[PDB]
A paper describes a structure:
Monellin, isolated from the African plant Dioscoreophyllum cumminsii, is, together with thaumatin, one of the most potent sweeteners known, being about 90,000 times sweeter than sucrose on a molar basis. Wild type monellin has a cystatin-like fold, composed of two non-covalently linked chains, which dissociate when heated above ~50 °C. This is accompanied by taste loss and prevents the use of the protein as a sweetener above this temperature. To circumvent this inconvenience, single chain derivatives with higher thermostability, among which MNEI, have been designed. All sweet proteins elicit a taste response upon interaction with the human taste receptor T1R2-T1R3, a heterodimeric G-protein coupled receptor (GPCR) located on specialised cells on the tongue.
The resulting constructs prepared for this study were therefore C41S, Y65R, S67K, D68N-MNEI (Mut1) and Q28K, C41S, Y65R-MNEI (Mut2). The other construct, Mut2 (Q28K,C41S,Y65R-MNEI), displayed instead amazing potency, with a recognition threshold of only 36 nM, roughly 30% lower than Y65R-MNEI and 3.5 times sweeter than the parent protein, according to literature data for MNEI34. Mut2 exhibited a stability comparable to that of Y65R-MNEI (Tm 70.1 and 71.4, respectively), whereas Mut1 appeared much less stable, with a Tm of 52.1 °C, about 20 °C lower than Mut2 and Y65R-MNEI. For both mutants, the asymmetric unit (a.u.) contains two protein molecules strongly interacting with each other and resulting in a dimer. In both Mut2 and Mut3, mutations do not alter the overall protein fold: the structure is very similar to that of MNEI. On the contrary, in both molecules present in the a. u. of Mut2 and Mut3, S41 side chain adopts conformation 1 and forms a hydrogen bond with a water molecule that connects S41 to main chain atoms of residues P40, I38, Y63. The mutation Y65R introduces at this site a charged residue, whose side chain is highly flexible and explores different conformations in the structures of Mut2 and Mut3, forming several interactions with solvent molecules, sometimes involved in packing contacts. In the wild-type protein, Q28 is a solvent exposed residue; its side chain adopts two distinct conformations, one of which is in direct contact with the side chain of residue E23 that is buried in a hydrophobic cavity formed by residues I26, Y29, L86 and F89. In Mut2, containing the mutation Q28K, the lysine side chain is pushed away toward the solvent, forming a stabilising interaction with the hydroxyl group of Y47 from a symmetry related mate in one of the two molecules present in the a.u. and remaining disordered in the other one.
Residue numbers in the entry: 1 to 49, 54 to 96
């Protein structure tokens, strides 16, 4: 894979919302309220071994705490899945 910094525009915010919504269905943290994806946002390109998919790592502020969310995206299907949601974590 290769990692790159991505900006925190609407698409990235919408990934953050996705992570919180998914976590709220999962229920590990009870009910979270999405606030914002903060910098830095990172995106890993995963080759088939030719792009297979991507992994986003986002710092997501929800319920006034910070969480680290890792989201996978399948290049062909366009489907996304919440892989990890850790925290609360300290600020990057």
């Amino acid at each position: 894979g290769e990692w790159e910094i991505i900006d925190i525009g609407p698409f990235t915010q919408n990934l953050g919302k996705f992570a919180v919504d998914e976590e709220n269905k999962i229920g590990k943290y009870g009910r979270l309220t999405f606030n914002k994806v903060i910098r830095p946002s990172m995106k890993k390109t995963i080759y088939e071994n030719e792009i297979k998919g991507y992994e986003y790592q986002l710092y997501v502020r929800a319920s006034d705490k910070l969480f680290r969310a890792d989201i996978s995206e399948d290049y062909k299907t366009r489907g996304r899945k919440l892989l990890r949601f850790n925290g609360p974590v300290p600020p990057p």
